[PDB]
Structure formats: structure tokens, C-alpha cells
Design a binder for this molecule. Structure first.
Ligand SMILES: O=C(Nc1ccc(F)cc1Cl)c1ccccc1[SeH]
Ligand SMILES: O=C(Nc1ccc(F)cc1Cl)c1ccccc1[SeH]
Ligand SMILES: *[Se][SeH]
Ligand SMILES: *[Se][SeH]
Ligand code: NI
Ligand code: NI
Ligand code: NI
Ligand code: NI
Ligand SMILES: [O-]
Ligand SMILES: [O-]
Lengths: 122, 570, 100, 570, 100, 100
């Protein structure tokens, strides 16, 4: 019965994030010579051009990590990450200007990615 | 991917079933429900969710379902529930309580809570958010009282006074058209919401009514002006015509009547009974019996709250000094002993816990503390939990029922009593964005940020010369919502319907938002949220023993309170 | 620290009391504001020590005597009032005729 | 009759060839020229020159070449020169720099600098006079920040924020039409010039542009809102249409791109690169390479200025606390080590000295000190003189070249970058009379008097109860230019052309002078006064070694600074 | 003296620390604002003495121990921050978990 | 206490002097505002003691010497002025070149 003012007594159990959404594991390589850190909610196909991965597997997806966290890639570092599905309307506008509409337009997204030198269009 | 509950609560604030201690009290509140979608929590910062094309929508203009302000991950404590949500503000009002972000990519986004180019963000994760406090017993005596009120989470001051004039030092009254006009103009510079009470005294209607038409928001009947059957009657006749509330401080002396004579003058009309326990004023010794009646909206003032070992000594002397009473004049000692009663102060604690006294208030600078209405509400709830145990209505070992009963006393119930609950008094969609953020460790003691009309007005923040705002000294300071013309848009002057229809704001050049007082004549005790009990309160005229339906109410005072010496430098 | 308005103001009473106590220690008869500051700070420090309101009503009459203060000062001070946080929250102390 | 130079300087301030030490630094400024006529110096007092029929003209009405205010015998330190002159002010503007007095009897009187019945006098003999500082990286977090800025000679705050909301605590952004309107109204009460930045984020033009039309003076792109290629592009498209500046805090994380991707999005358009060294934010580790480009207007913020033995310890921890980083989480430590770099902070000192970084700024209350932009400019110049010696361009053993290079960094260059140099940023005829008087012993540390629009706004002055104004305590205080409606006439709200054409000032009831932002899209590095160098800056991605045209830039930190413990009570 | 706004405010931290130190000397367990004032003033006086930021980050963890303060105070103070003029100008000191 | 504006401000000079005196006692050479605070408070406490203006004009030149203060401080202080209530009401004291 020591009192910590304003303390929490959390319930039992664990919180499952992004429940019911498809998960996908892909390997990603920072081919650049500077570090790249990627937030939880960036449309994964639109990340930095020097990240090498199967760009098609980033379409309509983002990192399956707690909201507001990030994955870090040191220069030359290759690792696996787990992606989850975007939700809501599954549309993306802005960021790298690869989508600007439905994420269902995979052909158009990959054509723009390839033109602009986003590594890993396969 | 799963997150344990300790780590989840640290990052986003607590979620369903988690409990949080209120300051250093023994009171625990439990999250009843959560509007989020786990994994799509909104947050702001470097690599965080609220970024363009991500949790921030980059397409929509402000008019297109975009917020001016999103409070992320708030733990709301309100009469309407204790729950986790994002709060969306637009045009100075609460427009959405739910889940904010970007429909492009997030599940479960409330349709009018889009984070867009136009949206500011306040992080409320790990904070408790309440409505601004509504203080309905304010003496306008010293303008320095406004920051004292803001620092303890008060956002609305209803009362009267012209400064440290004796009429104002005793009574919540701004008398007559001219003093009312002058104080409406003074109000243009006060960074808090205000409503002004006129003098509820006269034997003709016109001298009383002309105060309402001049811009008063209500009336105060006070024994120091003659709380006679005539003044009571004429004030309530005016109030019923004007749709404003009447507050009463009754005839302590029983000079023209006993309590039953005051109730007969009231004649079943609605009235707000101030300091209903009676140390602060009223028919000796039985005024507190008012709190049993269906047409009475009963409030306490704060120095009796809660009953402590120093309460009687402090009050007996306070009353002696204020009335210039002499310890060697037997009539003065008899008067004081009839007015300051351990029996009724002890029972007042229990009447609060039972929902028989509906409201708290200060009595700021007349017999009460401008910055301790919220503080003493929680000290009372904590003492009642310690002495009476969890209420029978509780579950999960939480104090949620008691917390909703007590938060109602200084938020929604005063607002309903005054006719202003359409604008203020709760965290609900469509109401003015008067919001108080609390760190749980400081809950009810020192507000972190006070939002007025959707802009921060007051904050505990540090050195203005520092690289970051957290270095010492951290103290309460007025923020940009109080500066220049923004003080007009972030605060409400509440006025009678007749003064508004007669163009008083334009006549006086008032720039503040104008609030209409309405709907406060066809309410009663049943309309007081979580505090709606009507019952027969008997106060023994010989012993001052209090009975509720023939059951004796005794309580003991406490020697120590939480929310006291751990926190305060003096 | 989270200072509220009253905490900031009341620091100035402690400071005025420290000033007055230095003046008294070098042998000066104290004046009206010096005497009020000393008694006021004594009350607020007593509350912080956990004394009762009734103890401080008694003690505040014995902090300074008429020989500690200038002519007329005892009769200028009808009473000294201070609010401070006791173990049971804020209370008002009134000391009547503190200097006889 | 001859006067020796010691006696002359004591009476009238220094003249041609005389040198003056800046505070306790090793920097000396030399009087380049003097507008006076020896023997006809203006001065004011008992039996002095500015008396009716003598140095004061008794014939002319105010409209007839008469001044409202004459600053006598000023030592001007400005990008335009270091020289001795009288300064004449009329209608709130600098109308003459030359020689004031009475043409009746004095030789060499500048024709529109007549001292007449209408003329006030400020004695500037023995003072240094500069333009008011222009701070272009202000977070509006705590209104107490304005006096902190005035006390160190700042007169213009450009930035954003709504108070201590998280968006504002991280970013110089007032987002969307409503928050902009509210902060324009708040600005009516701030006794300093202001311009507000909107959120430079969106993928559609309209959400960004509606901020400009609402009264924003510019935009801020910040990584915390998504410093993506799209947000960069749309913001600069808006800026080019609206003729306002864009400030950038780039993608530190390199999430959507490296520096070359940000430069490609910019596509040769003008941009103001904030905290270009990068401790305050930007592409890790090479953002500082921005300062070599012709379309980049590069500023530093102040905590890295200059490089000292405590700089890294203070910043590493500051960054850890502000981002809630954990010393035991390797990604957090790697991020901090990539961002806080002794190599780039050391090189930043030299880049300032070489004229490759054009501007200083605070980052007030976000990662910078509201009252230390001027202070740290001079500490940097002094450290560079100590370590690198006099610049090759100097003569007479004076530091005039370095002093003009450094004074430009917080006066004229920010004003040019922002599109406001037609109104502010230098002591020139036709510009607003924002003037700071300094005692040389306090130069750059504590301003003596700050003049805003030709009326003193802020002064170091003593006891207001005293017989004279010099007795203790001498402290910074707001003066009559801040009081009542004079705050409107002595200060400028800078706004976009479109908001002015659309009548926003009338709509919101703004009474402040309204300044038009213009001409900031067809400028570049070449337009930065004394700081116009373009070059290839290479930052080694492995070692963070800095090279300028293939030459390594290393510097050492210092253990002590001037303008520090001699002056400050804390 | 030429006091600027920060110099005026920071005098009040020194005063609050002197008040808290008197309370500690008469045997009171200190409360939240008392403890913050003591540690804060210690940091600013250390800067004035010419200590390094790194020295004060270490020392500020040893100024008060949990037995010097009331129950819960150690856990209420996550960190104390102060800016002061070092020999090399203003710097920020953050003391993490100053009272264990 | 009935404090007027000047009484409230001048408390801050006493406080700054107490701060500076603690710094001097632990062996620091004093800076410009520290030295001004010490001499100023000395003048106002001397008036309270009932010294003459002429006594304080003389004494204020002997409160601090050049070895008590940092390089340049003696030459930064041309004079120190203070008003205080003497037995014969408020008077101005000016100390010329207080530190030689
Ligand atoms: O009220 C108390 N007890 C009580 C009385 C009637 C009940 F029905 C239940 C309880 Cl716990 C109590 C017990 C000890 C001290 C104070 C009090 Se207010
Ligand atoms: O910059 C320094 N020296 C230097 C380097 C290249 C030059 F062309 C000239 C100099 Cl003096 C220096 C010398 C010692 C300490 C710091 C510095 Se920034
Ligand atoms: Se009531 Se004094
Ligand atoms: Se940034 Se605290
Ligand atoms: Ni009453
Ligand atoms: Ni009252
Ligand atoms: Ni930045
Ligand atoms: Ni910034
Ligand atoms: O009352
Ligand atoms: O920044």
C-alpha cells in the first residue's frame, strides 16, 4: 500500500495490433551509405529509393509495428520486416507521388516506381 | 504482434479495464471503453502516425471533415462516462469524440475527425481530460482570483461583484443597470467565461427586472440585502419571466421567517440553494433540509469540504472576524454556535456521497477558496471511500460510480442549474471546447493545460528563455488564448435572453462570444446528473442531529487529506 | 515545481520575514510591515510543521512582544491572518492582537 | 580650439578612426566615417545645442522637414557600414541618417533632419545602434517569450504555433485558416513584429493555399508532419504563386529520400533551410550540404552556436529527453549519434565565419533560446577571431569586416529571406524605426532601449518610485509603446498579399500596421549580404568529416565564452 | 543590475530552495515542490561554480535520497531540468530520476 | 503588510544580495549583477539602520574591492544608486566608483 500518485494498475492480457489483417514478411536492404528509418504508417512501396526489396510486396501495406514506432536500416543493412495491410479506403495520396489513388492500381504504381528508380521493381 | 498492457499504457495511455489512481488519493478510475482501432492509434512527432499521406490526410480542405485540433488518446472523466477517445475540435467547439486520423489508410476513423493540413495536435496520452469547472458562487472581489481559478481547472465563473466593495465582499451581486454594464465591460479583459448576478431584492418588479434587461444572467437573494418573503417572491417572478436562475442565501437570523416560510415564499418554483449546509449562510440551524426538496438545486461551498479536525476552529474564528463578533458578548457567541455546527458539516460529507447535494462551488473570497472547488470535491470522495467503502453500485474494484457522481458536482450540474449546459459543463459533441488536461499524479490539484474555446489559455510550463519549455521554474502562466483579441473568441459572456434581444452587447461594444441563458425554470433535483435524490432531511432544533428518512447521519472528521502537503509549497 | 499563483506570492512573505529577522538580529526595533511578515511566515511554517489552527492561534501571540517593535506598532496590528496547507488542507489562521 | 580624441569620444561618442570593444569580447569596431560638422554636434540638456533659436528651429511646422525623433551621435553597426550619424525618425520610419539640427545657424544639416517644436530627442552618444533582430525560427509556445526576445534586441518574430500544443512545441506551424485567424488576433497583444507560418504539408494545393489566403506570411515544412517529396513540392508551388517564403526541416530519418531527393523535390526553387547544421533537424548526417546551393537561404539555430565543451553533452541529452529515447534501446542511441555530431557542429562555426551560413535564428522553446540569437552571433565571431585570427579583408587592426558579416546574419539576411526587407532588417532611410541602443559594455548581451515604430517599447530602467530612473533595481521593463492602443502603431503584422487583398485585417478587426510579404521567390544565396558563398560541401557518410572544395574543416570547442558569467545572475 | 526576465524568475527558485532547506534542517520530510526547488537550485549554483553539464548530471542524483522526502515523491519526479550560465554560456542540465 | 510597488521590487534586491553573498562565501569572484546587488542592498539596509546619506556615500566605496570581483567588473560600475526610507523619509544615495 505504498502510494505512487497517478499510478496505473493495468489489466491482464496483451493488446493485438492490426488484428484480422494479412501479414507479409519481406527482406529489405539499405543499399545507400546513410541510415534510413521507416515509420509505422508510410505506404511501404513509397519508401526511400535506395531500399531494395520486392516493391510489389509493399503496395497497399505498411509496417506491422506499434503505431508511432519505426524500423531502422543502418547503411548496407539487410533484414526482414513484417508488413500489415492498409485499411480505411485503401487509398494513398502524396508521400512519394507513386499512388495518388487506389492501392489496387499495382501496374501504375510499379510503372512510376520503376521510372523514378525506386529499387526492386521486378 | 502483441504489446503487453504496461507497455501499451505507457505509449498510448490506458485502455479497456486498466485503472488509474487519482493523484495521491485511494480513488481508482477504470477505462470503460475505447474508441481506438489497435495499431491505428493517432500520435504526433518524428516518424509518428500524423504525417501527410499517413495518419494526416493531404487532400481535404478545412471545411471537408477536417479538424482544427485533435487531442489524441484522452482518458475522459465525465458524467457521460470514463473512457478512452480522441477529441476533435473545430470553430472552438467539440465536434467529435471518437477516433481521429486519415480514412485513406486507417480503420475506424470518425468521419468528421480527419487530421488534415488545418489540424493542430495536443497529445493527451497518459492524461486525464475533464470539462472545465463551472463555479456558480463567485464573488468578483480581486481580479487576481481568475488565475487562481484557472490553475485548479475552473473555466466558468458565475456570480457578482464590483471589486472590494462591502456589498460585493458579502454577496454575489452586481447591483443595478450601471454596475452590471461596467462589469460586462470589465469582463472583456477576464480570461474565463463569466455570468453576472443582479441583486434579487425589491418589493416592485421593475427595479429587479431592469437588471436582467441590462445584461445580468441571474439573480442572488442574500440575507445581507434582506432575504425577506417579498424579495424571494419578486426575484422568482422575475426569474420565471426572464428564464434565468435565482441563487439564495437565506435569512440565517430567522428574522422574517423560518425555513418553512422561505419555502412557502418560493412556492415550488426552481431555486439554487447556495452553501446548503449553512456555515456559509442560511436559516439556523436547519437550512440543509432544503437539499431534500424537488424544486431545490443544492450546492455546497468549499471550506466545509470535507470535514477535517481544523474545520470548526477555522470557521468559528473566520465567522467571528468577518462579522466583528465579540467572544465576551453572549448574543455573538450564541449566533456563531447556531451557525457553525459539527453535526451539519459532518452530515454534508455523507449527503454529497449519497447524491443529495448536487453541486460544489467556491464562495471565492467571501467564505471560500477560488482555486479549491475541484481539489475539495476529490478530497471529499476520497474521505467517503475511506470511511464508507466502495459504493454498492461499483464493480471491478473501480470507483467509477463515485467518480461520475463527484465530477458531475462541479461540471454538468452547475451548468444545468444556471441554464448554460447547452454551451458548457461536459465533454460532449456540440459544446464549447473548454477542456482541462491533468497528469494523473496532479489530478484535481494542478491543471497541466486549460483549453478555452479550442485554444490553450493557461498552462503549467517552464522557463520562457530555455531551449525547451520544461526547465524550471514550472509555474502556472497565461497562454496565447488570453492575449490581444483572442481573449474575445476563447471566452463566453453569458447574458439573459432579454438583454441579448435588446442589443446590450452592441450597445456596450462587447466582443466576447455571447452565451444565452435558457431552460432553467422547468428543471428540478431530478435533472441533477448522478445527484438526483429527494428525501426528508430532519435537523433536530435542540441537538442539530441530522436524519435522512429517520436514519441518523454522523461522520468523523479526518486529521489528514490527500492532495495537500505532498503538492503545495505553502 | 508547478507553482500556482498563491505559492508564488507567499514566497515573498517568507523573504520579507527573513529580511525582518536579519534586522531584528542586528538590534533594530521592527516596524509595521516587518512585524506582520515575521508573524505571518511563522504561521505558514507552523502549518507546514503540522501544528493545529488552535496551536497557531495561541503561539502567534508570543512571536514578537512590544519591546521588539517601534512605538505604536502593537496598536496598529489588530490581527494577522494567513492561509496555509495543513496536513488536512488549506485553513485560515487568525491571530488576534498578536503583540500586546 | 582643439579637443583631444579621448575627451571628444567621452562627450559625443567616438569619431573617425576610433575603435570600440564589443562587450568583453576581443572584437573591435572602428568608426569608418562621421556625418557631423565638428563644433555643431547635436546634444540635448541644460545649456546644450537643441534649444529654440539655436540647434532647435523655432519656425517650421512638423510637415516642414521637422523630425518626430532625433537619435543624436549614434554609432551605427549595420550591413551598410559602421559609422557615426544622427538618425531622424518621422511617422514611425527612419527618414534621415546624417546630421540633425537647425539650418538657421548650423553647417551640414541634412535638409529633412530639422529639430523643431515637434521633435523628441534620444541621446545615442556613447551607444551602439543596430537594427532590431529578425528571428525567423520562432515557436509561439509561451507569451513570456516576447520580453525574453526584446531584452536581447529582437524586434521581429517569424514562426508559428498556438501555445504549448505538441504540434507547436515541435514545429513552427499555425495550422489552417482558423488557427491562423486566432493567432492573428492574439498577435494584437504581442509587443513585437510578427509573421505566421502555415503548415507546409499536403498532396493537394487547396488545403495549403487556404492558409496563405487566411493571413499566413509563409510556410513551414517539418518532418514531424511528413517532410515528403509531395509536401515539399506542393508547398513550393503555393509559395511561388503567393510570393511567400518556405522554411524546411527535412526528413532526418531519410525515410522517403536522402538529401539529393529533397533537393530534387525543391527543383531549384528558393527555400529557407532551418538549422542547416542538422542537430536541430534534417537528413542525417549530411543536411548541412544544403548551405552550398544557390537556391538555399541557410540559417543556424542557436544552441550549437558556438561549439563549446558542454555543447555535445547538453544536446545528446536534450535530444534523448525530447524524443523520449532510451539509452538501452540501440536504435534510439544510433539515431541520436547520427543526429548530434561534433564534426558538423565544429564545421558550422567555420561556415559562419566564411559567409556560407547566411543567417542566425533561435528555435525559441523547441530547441533554442528566445533571448540568445544576438548573444551567440557575437560569441561565434569572437571564437572565430581567437582561433582563425582577423579575416584577410580587415585593415587598421579593426574587426569591421567580420562585424558586418555577423550583424547581417540576424538583421538584413532574415528580412530578405522572408520578403520583409522593404520594412525591417537594417538602419536605412525608408525603413521602419525598429532600433536597438546598446551600451558597448553590454553590447549583444542586454539592450539599453528597444525602439519599435519610433517609440521606446522596452528598456533597462530602474525604480519607478525613485526621483530619477537609474536607481536599483535596473531591469528590463515594457515601456509606453506597449501600452493601450500604441501597441497597434508601433508593431507590424506581416501577411501574404492575397490575405491583404481579400481584406483579412478588416474581417478580423486587426489594428496593427499591416506589412506585405513580397519579393522572396526571385532571390538566392547571392542576395545574402556579406554571406553569399556557394560551394560544394561534402559530408563523409562514414566519418562525418566536412570538406569545402575538398579542404577538411575541423575546429576545436572552447571551455569559456565572453558575454557569459561576467553578466548573468544565473 | 540589468536583470532580464529569466534572471528575475530564477531568483524565485533560489528562494524556494532556501525555504525547502530550512524545512529539511528542522527535520521535515520534503514534498514535491520543495525537492524540485532544492535540486534545481543545486544545478544552477553548480553552473555558477563552473562545473560541467556531465558533473551536474551525476551530482543531481545524490542531492536528496528517498528518506529525505515524503512517500511517492521519488516516483513523482521523473527528471529535473534547469538552464544556467556556465563558463561557456547557457546550457541545459537534465537530471534523470534524481531521487531513487 | 500593505506592500506598495517599490517595497515588492526592492525585496528582489535583498534576495539577489543574499544569493551573491553565498557565492562570495564559497570563494567565487563576483560578477557585475552580483556586485551591484551586494552594494545596493548594503545601502538600503544602512538607511534602515539610520545612517546618513553622507555615511553611505563613504561606506559604499568599501563594501567590495577589485579582488572580490571578476576582471573588468570594477570598470563596468561607474556608480550605484538606491533609494530607501531613512529616518527622515526617502532619500537617494549615489556611490561613485564603488569598486576601485
Ligand atoms: O459514515 C460512516 N459509516 C457508515 C454509516 C452508515 C452506513 F450505512 C454505512 C457506513 Cl460505512 C463512517 C464510519 C466511520 C467514520 C466516518 C463515517 Se461517515
Ligand atoms: O580553424 C582553425 N584554424 C585554421 C584552419 C584553416 C585555415 F585556413 C586557417 C586557420 Cl587559422 C582553428 C585553429 C585552432 C582551433 C580552432 C580552429 Se576553427
Ligand atoms: Se470578511 Se474580513
Ligand atoms: Se521537448 Se520536452
Ligand atoms: Ni452566502
Ligand atoms: Ni457568497
Ligand atoms: Ni526543426
Ligand atoms: Ni523549430
Ligand atoms: O456566501
Ligand atoms: O526546429
Amino acid at each position: 500500500n505504498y502510494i505512487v500518485p497517478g499510478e496505473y494498475r493495468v489489466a491482464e492480457g496483451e493488446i493485438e495490433i492490426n488484428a484480422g489483417r494479412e501479414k507479409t514478411t519481406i527482406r529489405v536492404s539499405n543499399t545507400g551509405d546513410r541510415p534510413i528509418q521507416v515509420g509505422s504508417h508510410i505506404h511501404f512501396v513509397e519508401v526511400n529509393k535506395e531500399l531494395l526489396f520486392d516493391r510489389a510486396e509493399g503496395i497497399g501495406r505498411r509496417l506491422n509495428i506499434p503505431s508511432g514506432t519505426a524500423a531502422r536500416f543502418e547503411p548496407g543493412e539487410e533484414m526482414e520486416v513484417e508488413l500489415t495491410e492498409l485499411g480505411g479506403n485503401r487509398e494513398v495520396f502524396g508521400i512519394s507521388d507513386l499512388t495518388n489513388g487506389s492501392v489496387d492500381n499495382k501496374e501504375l504504381i510499379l510503372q512510376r516506381a520503376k521510372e523514378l528508380g525506386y529499387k526492386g521493381v521486378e | 504482434m502483441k504489446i503487453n498492457r504496461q507497455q501499451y499504457a505507457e505509449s498510448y495511455g490506458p485502455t479497456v479495464g486498466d485503472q488509474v489512481r487519482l493523484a495521491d488519493t485511494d480513488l481508482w478510475i477504470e477505462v470503460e471503453k475505447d474508441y481506438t482501432t489497435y495499431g491505428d492509434e493517432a500520435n504526433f512527432g518524428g516518424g509518428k502516425v500524423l504525417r501527410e499521406g499517413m495518419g494526416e490526410n493531404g487532400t481535404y480542405t478545412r471545411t471537408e471533415n477536417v479538424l482544427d485540433l485533435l487531442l489524441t488518446n484522452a482518458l475522459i472523466l465525465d458524467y457521460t462516462g470514463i473512457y478512452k477517445a480522441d477529441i476533435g475540435v473545430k470553430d472552438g467547439y467539440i465536434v467529435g469524440i471518437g477516433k481521429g486520423g486519415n480514412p485513406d489508410i486507417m480503420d475506424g476513423v470518425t468521419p468528421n475527425m480527419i487530421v488534415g493540413t488545418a489540424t493542430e495536435v495536443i497529445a493527451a496520452e497518459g492524461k486525464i481530460v475533464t470539462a472545465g469547472g463551472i463555479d456558480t458562487h463567485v464573488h468578483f472581489i480581486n481580479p487576481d482570483q481568475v488565475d487562481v481559478a484557472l490553475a485548479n481547472g475552473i473555466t466558468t465563473l458565475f456570480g457578482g461583484g464590483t471589486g472590494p466593495a462591502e456589498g460585493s465582499k458579502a454577496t454575489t451581486v452586481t447591483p443595478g443597470p450601471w454596475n452590471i454594464e461596467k462589469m460586462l465591460k470589465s469582463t472583456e479583459g477576464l480570461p474565463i467565461n463569466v455570468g453576472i448576478l443582479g441583486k434579487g431584492h425589491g418589493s416592485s418588479i421593475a427595479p429587479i427586472m431592469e437588471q436582467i434587461d441590462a445584461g445580468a444572467a441571474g439573480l442572488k437573494i442574500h440575507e445581507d440585502w434582506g432575504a425577506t418573503p417579498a424579495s424571494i417572491d419578486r426575484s422568482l417572478t422575475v426569474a420565471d419571466e426572464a428564464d434565468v436562475q435565482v441563487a439564495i442565501h437565506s435569512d440565517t437570523l430567522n428574522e422574517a421567517g423560518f425555513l418553512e416560510d422561505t419555502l412557502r415564499a418560493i412556492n415550488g418554483r426552481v431555486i439554487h440553494s447556495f452553501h446548503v449546509e449553512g456555515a456559509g449562510g442560511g436559516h439556523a440551524p436547519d437550512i440543509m433540509a432544503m437539499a431534500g426538496h424537488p424544486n431545490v438545486l443544492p450546492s455546497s461551498t468549499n471550506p466545509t469540504r470535507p470535514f477535517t479536525v481544523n474545520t470548526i476552529d477555522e470557521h468559528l474564528d473566520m465567522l467571528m472576524v468577518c462579522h466583528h463578533l465579540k467572544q465576551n458578548i453572549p448574543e455573538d457567541v450564541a449566533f456563531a454556535d447556531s451557525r457553525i455546527r459539527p453535526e451539519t458539516i459532518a452530515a454534508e460529507d455523507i449527503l454529497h456521497d449519497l447524491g443529495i447535494i448536487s453541486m460544489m462551488s467556491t464562495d471565492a473570497l467571501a467564505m471560500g477558496r477560488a482555486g479549491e472547488m475541484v481539489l475539495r470535491t476529490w478530497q471529499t470522495a476520497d474521505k467517503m471511500k475511506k470511511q464508507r467503502g466502495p459504493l454498492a453500485e461499483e464493480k471491478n474494484g473501480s470507483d467509477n460510480f463515485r467518480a461520475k457522481r463527484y465530477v458531475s458536482k462541479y461540471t454538468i450540474n452547475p451548468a444545468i442549474a444556471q441554464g448554460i449546459a447547452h454551451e458548457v459543463g461536459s465533454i460532449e459533441e456540440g459544446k464549447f471546447a473548454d477542456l482541462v488536461l491533468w497528469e494523473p499524479k496532479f489530478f484535481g490539484v494542478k491543471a497541466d493545460r486549460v483549453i478555452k474555446g479550442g485554444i490553450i489559455a493557461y498552462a503549467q510550463i517552464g522557463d520562457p528563455s530555455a531551449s525547451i519549455p520544461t526547465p524550471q521554474p514550472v509555474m502556472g502562466r497565461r497562454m496565447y488564448g488570453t492575449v490581444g483579441d483572442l481573449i474575445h473568441d476563447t471566452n463566453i459572456t453569458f447574458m439573459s435572453k432579454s438583454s441579448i434581444q435588446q442589443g446590450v452587447p452592441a450597445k456596450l461594444g462587447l466582443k466576447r462570444r455571447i452565451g444565452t441563458v435558457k431552460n432553467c425554470r422547468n428543471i428540478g433535483k431530478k435533472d441533477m446528473k448522478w445527484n438526483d435524490v429527494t428525501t426528508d432531511i430532519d435537523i433536530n432544533p435542540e441537538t442539530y442531529e441530522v436524519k435522512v428518512d429517520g436514519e441518523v447521519l454522523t461522520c468523523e472528521p479526518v486529521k489528514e487529506l490527500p492532495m495537500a502537503q505532498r503538492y503545495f509549497l505553502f | 515545481m508547478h507553482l500556482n499563483p498563491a505559492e508564488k506570492e507567499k514566497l515573498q512573505i517568507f523573504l520579507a520575514s527573513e529580511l525582518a529577522l536579519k534586522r531584528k538580529a542586528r538590534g533594530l526595533k521592527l516596524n509595521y510591515p516587518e512585524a506582520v511578515a515575521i508573524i505571518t511566515s511563522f504561521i505558514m511554517e507552523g502549518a507546514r510543521d503540522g501544528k493545529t489552527v488552535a496551536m497557531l492561534m495561541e503561539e502567534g501571540k508570543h512571536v514578537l512582544t512590544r519591546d521588539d517593535v517601534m512605538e505604536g506598532v502593537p496598536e496598529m496590528i489588530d490581527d494577522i491572518q494567513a492561509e496555509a496547507t495543513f496536513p488536512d488542507g488549506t485553513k485560515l489562521v487568525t491571530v488576534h492582537n498578536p503583540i500586546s
